[model samples]
Target: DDELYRQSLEIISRYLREQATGAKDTKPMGRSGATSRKALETLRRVGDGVQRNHETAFQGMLRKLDIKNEDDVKSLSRVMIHVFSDGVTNWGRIVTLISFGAFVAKHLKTINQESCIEPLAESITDVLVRTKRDWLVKQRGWDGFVEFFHVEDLE
Candidate 1:
């Protein structure tokens, strides 16, 4: 419960923190750091894709949906949770979900709502843990993410 859910939160938070700080090249060092770095590298493309493709749609959502506070974020995340729960999920799908959270974080950053980042990250974490824990548990959580997206030549 704690490991997968917590790492999910950490990954989303770390990805946003790097982007918010514009520190794409900073390599975090530790036992789990390399694993997270790899996952982030792979997930980065997905997040960019969401930003590139869905920016308009997301902007529309934001126009129609004002996120003036953390409660608004929580309400928005409920819709996200519904969307994510509708289908059979894989690691790729999970990565895509995290990427969307990153996009939302970026949006919040732009609007000077950076304070909402933590709750957004936490919301995404809970969505994954609450809905996908069985599959993630069997898949070995973030370690599984590293293995799934491992690149032998990227060192």
Candidate 2:
């Protein structure tokens, strides 16, 4: 149970630090949000058609956009605006793989481009390649997203 002991100690340390330093609210938390399939659907009309191997498609789009194949953190926000600027319907399974690349790229840029962007890309492919698009209807907070997405929480 060494891992459990370490985790408990870390939790207690955090609680004590919060109590001592007036860490009173959650507003200071950094950005937290997700994209939707409706937006992706509109994109699919203009983007490359949705294909089964979403990860490969996403990589291709990234190359076209110049957001992948290299690590440069500074150009993300500007490029993101550019991606959405023309209002393109470009994507698949339902969401454009490019969109996933763009989204994950933006986050990676924030973290530092030198980091591995591939794993993040793969993770997005796994998360966004679902068969249905119903989940993107309403915006929800952390717990709400969990409750809305996973009816059966982790035991």
Candidate 3:
């Protein structure tokens, strides 16, 4: 029972994380300066919040099952593309959007794509915010992991 749940969480978390943070080989498009740094920080914080919530939910489930360190949160995160190819595709698109948005936002004055960036950023931010909230409220334990994580309410 615990194994089944763990597997499910692993699949979901892997998909979400990949969507948030590009794969290791991909390069970030944000500028090197302060504003870009702030955007990256925001993204990281949101990513961490999502990851912590997943871990907390797994731990809560384990405790309820009277299971030991069967959670293996890191292992879940380490899932390879072989487990699900769809995740890889989703992640690639998300990364592209984020990189484009960051690059455009950073060089708005010079980049003619600034007009397009605003809409793209809005869309990507919407997905990130909604997905994180949905995972917290709908998938994981509500009070234990979701509430405790306290993701910024985008309501």
Candidate 4:
């Protein structure tokens, strides 16, 4: 359950910003890579109060994507949030979002670089926050995964 989550997106966003300006990576990277260090950093920092939503923020990210087509962006973000955020809780959904981030990151090689990090960040944060909440959830388990993937729940 260790992820930089929002912080990952922010750094990746920062990288993209640099890329957009034709600036090069002059400095060495973070020792761990990303704020919060993939632990309960924000969770602890926020003092056990309610954290923020990840998927809404993710959908908001769709607004700023390179997709260029507004309708497509809206539709895709909705589809992503709805589909990904379905039926899950903390530890579980965190895995999903991290994997999704991994999916995107693999695509971008941030495995760390890419574009339109904010909405993606928000979407993830939204997902991270909802349901059965004393604090938040990342617990959408394999049932949701296989349900989502449209394949067998193969053992």
Candidate 5:
């Protein structure tokens, strides 16, 4: 039931992690140039919007979280799940979740706590797939994401 779903999870997780950590390779997969290229292209579609519109709001909220330990990470996970599950599941809220994680990723990098990112990724995965699986499925997953926020080149 989750094959397509799981692949999308890994795609977003790996893309976010590579973006957060560094871009040494910048290729998301092995040897398949087309596959890797598409993955990155898809990410940019959603990624650019999040950083431009939502980054500051996320940073402001994350300032209070100040996750410095495993317990803090867990609580952040709980908080995310609670916040996400409480309201109507829509692309806007979903984008907020992704944007928040990006700042948290930056925060971890700043504090020399990059190790926490993996756990954070797990939390994000849980929130998206486990907590909001139905909504995502109904929306057609990442494909839906691109369609929702896609912008045409207007040069």
Candidate 6:
């Protein structure tokens, strides 16, 4: 069991690293001059924080249980979605959405914003209803299926 868990962790860690650093062969999806730099910086800081916090929590749990080794502390982290559609419909909507999405994504273990089609579509609809910049939102939705997720609260 420990061997299997360690192997899984290795695979998962590799996948996460790849995801964080877009593919080497392909042109990155949301790669823009300004936004790309910002996104990369954000990802680096957030990813480091997530990894460190996970290790800290895992070590604490191991100590509490008198466990040893990385294999013994095999645990799963999940991504939780917190919808804030209603909040986005207010004033300064773009700023609010960007800030909120960044906050959520920064704390997230893995964001399935692109894959979870229905919720992503609904969030877009809400944005359209709220903002004067409907066209911009529409364009972004078409261009990038942006969404947010956050680390699961263990407590």
Judging by TM-score against the true structure, name the best candidate.
1
Per-model C-alpha lDDT, please?
A: 0.74, 0.35, 0.35, 0.39, 0.68, 0.33
Please, what are the lDDT tens digits per residue for candidate 3 over residues 78-120?
2312223234333323333343333323333233333433343
Q: Put down candidate 4 lDDT per residue, 48-98, tens digits, no spaces.
A: 121133445544553454343233323455666676656744444444454
What is the Cα-based lDDT of residue 52 in candidate 6?
56
Give the Cα error of residue 32 in candidate 4, in Å: 16
All models, RMSD in angstroms? 2.8, 15.6, 17.8, 12.8, 3.1, 15.1
Candidate 6's C-alpha runs over 4 A off are 1-33, 56-79, 82-155
Q: What is the TM-score ranking, best to worst? A: 1, 5, 4, 2, 3, 6
Clashing pairs counted in every model? 0, 10, 0, 33, 0, 1
Model 2 agreement with the true structure over 1-155: per-residue lDDT tens digits: 13322222222222222323334323222212122222222332322233333658555655565544344323543454444434432222223434454345444455456243544333333333221123322333223323333422222
Looking at model 5, residue 117 earns an lDDT score of 78
Model 6 C-alpha lDDT per residue in residues 1-155, reported as the tens digit of each score? 13322222222223233443344313433323233333333433444455455556534533454323222212211111123333444323433333332232222323433232223223433333343345344434212211221223311
Clashing pairs in 2: 43-89, 43-90, 44-89, 44-90, 46-89, 47-89, 47-90, 50-92, 91-96, 92-95
The TM-scores of all predictions, comma-separated, are: 0.80, 0.30, 0.25, 0.37, 0.79, 0.25
| lDDT-better candidate, 2 vs 6 | 2
Q: Which ranges of candidate 4 are over 4 A from the true structure?
A: 1-35, 38-74, 88-90, 108-113, 130-155
Span of ten consecutive residues with least summed lDDT in model 1: 23-32
Evaluation by TM-score, superior candidate among 2 and 6: 2
Given candidate 1, what's the lDDT at residue 15?
Answer: 83
Better of 4 and 6 by TM-score: 4
Q: Which ten residues in a row have the lowest lDDT in candidate 3?
A: 73-82
